[PDB]
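Bench log, entry 3. Co-assembly request; chain sequences pasted below exactly as received.
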Amino acid sequence: NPYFAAGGGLMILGTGLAVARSGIIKASRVLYRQM
Amino acid sequence: NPYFAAGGGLMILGTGLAVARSGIIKASRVLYRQM
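Structure output for the full assembly:
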């Protein structure tokens, strides 16, 4: 295993945070202020 | 645990202060100069 791949875990955590933010903002845009 | 992965906490701090800044600027632009 690589010995300095801890940044890669932070990279995928950041992508997860980004897609979660996109999901929640789309959900709020489509349900609470649109439905 | 790999201690270089502890920078993910600073990632959380950054994304918390960013949304806090967004919330306070929205609140200032809706309460004082709008309401």
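Helices of chain B lie at 7-31. Chain B touches chain A through seven residues (CB under 8 Å).
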